[PDB]
């Protein structure tokens, strides 16, 4: 058992397009509240992003609004995931 | 030893310290702190849970 919902100052993004850069996550996530940091770790199989990224808000309540409005929605021509950076896990484990 | 030095701040690291929040670069094998980056201690815990096929990179290791 657990809560029906949760919030945090940081949240996860995945399934984004192959041409997405850290500037896209800012312009895509800014209307829900002010962003303060963004991160994209490097994948060594092809020297590009792993197909996911990270973003951080000025408040935890603004992250819940970014999830409530872009979760499982199209960004660059295909669906992307949006949720807190705690409950999820990569498709590689 | 005293030859250790961070690529982004004047601080350094011990040869046996593992309680400090730090990551290793995937392209030049150099260590880094969380405070000399735009990162935060909450985002550091998820980076630790990512698969080893993905890793952090210096302010230049991401472009060159």
């Amino acid at each position: 058992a657990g809560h029906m919902a949760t919030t945090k100052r940081v949240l996860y993004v995945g399934g984004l397009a192959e041409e997405v850069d850290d500037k896209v996550l800012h312009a895509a996530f800014i209307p829900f509240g002010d962003i303060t940091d963004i991160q994209i770790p490097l994948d060594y199989e092809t020297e590009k992003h792993r197909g996911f990224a990270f973003v951080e808000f000025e408040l935890a309540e603004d992250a819940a609004a970014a999830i409530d409005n872009m979760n499982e929605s199209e960004l660059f021509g295909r669906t992307i995931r949006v949720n807190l950076a705690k409950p999820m896990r990569i498709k590689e484990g | 030893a005293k030859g250790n030095f961070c690529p982004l701040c004047d601080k350094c690291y011990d040869d046996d310290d593992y309680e400090s929040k730090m990551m290793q670069c995937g392209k030049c094998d150099r260590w880094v702190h969380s405070k000399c980056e735009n990162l935060s201690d909450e985002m550091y815990e998820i980076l630790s849970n990512l698969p080893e096929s993905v890793a952090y990179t210096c302010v230049n290791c991401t472009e060159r």
Binding site: - | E19, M22, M23, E52, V54
Partner: peptide, 13 residues
């Protein structure tokens, strides 16, 4: 990623 919080062959346990 490679860190001081973890460096095992896998994140499982």
């Amino acid at each position: 990623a490679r860190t001081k919080q973890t460096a095992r062959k896998s994140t499982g346990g």
